[PDB]
């Protein structure tokens, strides 16, 4: 059986190099110098080098002495282990999208209308434009009056407007974009994007309780965490046996009077002592600001480092002096 040899090529041109070499084999297979190799392999997830299935490195060299994309592998080729054949051959696997190219790269766009021609779709998008002021960009709301005042390439149709190379806006850009240039899977816009247009997070050292099943109302400490079905190892009170529970069965229950932290939300980054634990609402007085925060047990978290008392930007602390106006 022929063996596989790694030969290096230009990145992003492996398929074109393979097509060129097999076309050269077609053009020279009936000649006096045929290619004695068996095949070539170009995986879709492997970039930088390709595989040659052949018996000899001399045959590999005689195959790759063609187009100059394979020069650095023409200097030397490497071998593939016999057990790596299978690992080479294996292949592993009113909406919202994100644009690929242009100045609007990686931005949330709302697919409003889908054209049945399967070519372009209409997107409502936030314009990253300077309204023809700097160019002769952060996201901001479209200003039809401002762009009409600045003039230039602009056409006014009330709420609808055309500017800067057939960029269409209404009330918000409403422009057709390519199906291949948009990504329709794996977007998941957040609440801020919803306003403009489940999850499990368990950490070791925290206490979680079981509220259902034959092991009901059982509080135990978190030892491990997994993706969906954790099969946790809880340290239950008066129970040295090491049970198993998923995140759906567990609930982040904390004992009365402990330092609790908010992982995310409006009250994120705060530390405080709880007041009364209801079934969903937990009220706490935060430490730096003795203020009532009503948060969820899922948003709650236990840690030993209290609030630092400084902003997210690292510029102003709590209880600080600033200038509202001069």
């Amino acid at each position: 059986d022929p063996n596989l040899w790694t030969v290096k090529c230009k990145i992003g041109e492996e398929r074109a190099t393979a097509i060129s070499l097999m076309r050269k084999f077609i053009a020279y297979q009936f000649t006096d110098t045929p290619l004695q190799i068996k095949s070539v392999v170009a995986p879709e997830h492997v970039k930088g080098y390709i595989y040659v299935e052949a018996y000899k490195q001399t045959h590999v060299k005689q195959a790759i002495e063609g187009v100059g994309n394979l020069r650095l592998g023409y200097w030397n080729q490497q071998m593939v282990p016999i057990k790596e054949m299978t690992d080479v051959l294996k292949v592993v696997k009113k909406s919202w999208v994100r644009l690929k190219r242009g100045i609007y790269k990686d931005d949330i766009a709302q697919v409003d209308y889908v054209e049945p021609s399967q070519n372009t779709i209409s997107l409502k998008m936030i314009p990253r434009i300077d309204y023809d002021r700097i160019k002769a960009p952060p996201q901001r709301l479209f200003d039809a009056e401002k762009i009409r005042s600045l003039g230039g390439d602009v056409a006014s149709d009330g709420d609808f407007l055309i500017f800067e190379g057939n960029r269409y806006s209404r009330k918000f850009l409403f422009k057709s974009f390519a199906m291949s240039a948009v990504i329709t899977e794996g977007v998941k816009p957040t609440l801020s994007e919803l306003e403009k247009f489940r999850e499990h997070n368990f950490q070791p050292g925290d206490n979680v309780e079981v509220c259902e099943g034959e092991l009901i109302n059982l509080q135990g400490k978190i030892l491990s965490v997994d993706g969906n079905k954790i099969t946790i190892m809880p340290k239950h009170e008066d129970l040295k046996d090491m049970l198993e529970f998923p995140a759906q069965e567990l609930r982040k229950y904390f004992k009365m009077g402990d330092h609790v932290k908010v992982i995310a939300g409006r009250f994120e980054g705060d530390t405080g002592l709880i007041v009364r634990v209801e079934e969903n609402f937990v009220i706490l007085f935060s430490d730096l600001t003795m203020h009532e925060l009503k948060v969820l047990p899922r948003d709650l978290q236990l840690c030993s480092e209290t609030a630092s008392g400084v902003d997210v930007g690292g510029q102003h602390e709590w209880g600080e002096l600033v200038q509202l106006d001069p």
Partner: protein
């Protein structure tokens, strides 16, 4: 040969039975190169669309199938040389499967990819 060899990268799609990776132009001009008599690929487009899958992962240039362990792995050692697909995502229609079974050619799926 060159008739089996595709001429361009546009509209590449693989067959469902022999996993032959050829373009729409030579499906229209020649059809299949392996089981054309068993499929009657010539003279239509809707049935060719049903009998071909546009989603294929990886291609292999088997041209010496009598001495190729890769050809023995994908069971294409008895087929003609050409461009074949490792994985083909699709299935023939029930009537075509039943008529192939009646003619004596059992349809074996080429979907060798691991689904999760």
């Amino acid at each position: 040969a060159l008739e089996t060899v595709p001429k361009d990268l546009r509209h590449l799609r693989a067959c469902l039975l022999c996993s032959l990776v050829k373009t729409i132009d030579q499906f229209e001009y020649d059809g299949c190169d392996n089981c054309d008599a068993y499929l009657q690929m010539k003279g239509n487009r809707e049935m060719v669309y049903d009998c071909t899958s546009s989603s294929f992962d990886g291609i292999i240039a088997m041209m010496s199938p009598e001495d190729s362990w890769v050809s023995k792995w994908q069971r294409v050692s008895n087929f003609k040389p050409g461009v074949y697909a490792v994985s083909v995502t699709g299935r023939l229609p029930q009537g075509i499967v039943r008529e192939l079974k009646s003619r004596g050619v059992a349809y074996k799926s080429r979907d060798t990819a691991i689904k999760t």
